[PDB]
Amino acid sequence: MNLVLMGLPGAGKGTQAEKIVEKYGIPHISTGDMFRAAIKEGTELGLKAKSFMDKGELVPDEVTIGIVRERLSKDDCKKGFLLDGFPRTVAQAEALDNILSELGKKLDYVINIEVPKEELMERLTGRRICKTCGATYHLIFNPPKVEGICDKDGGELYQRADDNPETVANRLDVNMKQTQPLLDFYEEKGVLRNIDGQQDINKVFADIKALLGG
Numbered sequence: 001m002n003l004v005l006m007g008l009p010g011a012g013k014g015t016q017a018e019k020i021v022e023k024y025g026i027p028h029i030s031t032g033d034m035f036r037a038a039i040k041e042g043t044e045l046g047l048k049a050k051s052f053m054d055k056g057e058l059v060p061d062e063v064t065i066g067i068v069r070e071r072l073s074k075d076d077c078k079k080g081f082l083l084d085g086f087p088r089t090v091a092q093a094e095a096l097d098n099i100l101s102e103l104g105k106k107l108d109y110v111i112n113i114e115v116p117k118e119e120l121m122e123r124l125t126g127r128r129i130c131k132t133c134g135a136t137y138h139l140i141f142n143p144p145k146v147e148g149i150c151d152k153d154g155g156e157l158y159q160r161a162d163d164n165p166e167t168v169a170n171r172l173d174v175n176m177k178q179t180q181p182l183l184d185f186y187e188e189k190g191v192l193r194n195i196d197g198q199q200d201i202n203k204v205f206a207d208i209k210a211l212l213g214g
C-alpha cells in the first residue's frame, strides 16, 4: 500500500501514522520528523529548514522534494509506505507523481484527516511531548496519568517549539492556503479519501482501517 496522510497542522497525522505502521508494517515517512532530525544532525539542510519551521512557514519545495526522493528510493519502501505531511503544495504533489513513476509505483490513497481550525489550535497548544521517549499527550484529550510526566518512563513533558500560539497561527494560515489546491489535485486523480478526525483516536483509526481493508 502506497499512502499519503494529509491534514492541517494538529489534525492527528502522527497519531494515526503510528497505528498504521503497527498494523501494516510499512515505513512512516514524515517530512517534519526528517527536518527535525536534520536540525539535530546540525546539517546545512537542517539549519536552513529551521528558519522556516520556527516561523511556521513551509520549507521550500525543491529541498523538500529532494529528501523525499532519496528516502523513497530505499529498500524498505518497495512493498509500501506511509508519507505523512508530504505533499504540502501542488508542486510537491506533481513531484511525487514523477518520483513514483520513476519507481514504477502509484499512490493508492491520499487520506485527508479533517478537523476545524479552532480545534486544531487547541490540539497544538495543548500538546505535550516526552523529553526522553517522544511519547505524545494532550492536556485535554489524552492527558498523562501524572501531571507533567510521561506515563511509560518517568520523563519530563515539554512543548514543541513551534506549538506556541503565534507559530501555530501562522502554521494554520500557511497550510490552509494550500489545502483546496491539494484537495482538488487528488480528487481529480480519484485517490482522495476524507476522514473525520474529530473522533476518539481509536475511532479515527477504525475509519482508516475500513478504508485500507479495501
Ligand SMILES: Nc1ncnc2c1ncn2[C@@H]1O[C@H](COP(=O)(O)OP(=O)(O)OP(=O)(O)OP(=O)(O)OP(=O)(O)OC[C@H]2O[C@@H](n3cnc4c(N)ncnc43)[C@H](O)[C@@H]2O)[C@@H](O)[C@H]1O
Binding pocket: 007, 008, 009, 010, 011, 012, 013, 014, 015, 016, 030, 031, 032, 033, 035, 052, 053, 054, 056, 057, 058, 059, 060, 064, 084, 085, 086, 087, 088, 092, 123, 124, 126, 127, 128, 136, 137, 138, 139, 141, 142, 171, 197, 198, 199, 200, 201, 204
Ligand atoms: N512537505 C513539507 N513541505 C515543506 N515544509 C514542511 C513539509 N513537511 C514538514 N515541513 C516543515 O516542518 C514543519 C513541521 O511539520 P508538521 O507537518 O507541522 O509536523 P508534524 O509533526 O508531522 O505534524 P503536526 O505537528 O501538525 O501534528 P500531527 O497532525 O502529526 O498531529 P499529532 O498526531 O501529533 O496530534 C496533535 C495533538 O492532538 C492530539 N490528538 C491526536 N488525535 C486526536 C484525536 N482524535 N482527538 C483528540 N486529540 C487528538 C495529540 O495527542 C496531540 O497532542 C512545518 O511547519 C514545515 O515548516
Ligand SMILES: [Mg+2]
Binding pocket: 013, 014, 030, 032, 085
Ligand atoms: Mg506530525
Ligand SMILES: [Zn+2]
Binding pocket: 130, 131, 132, 133, 134, 135, 150, 151, 152, 153, 154, 155
Ligand atoms: Zn516517555
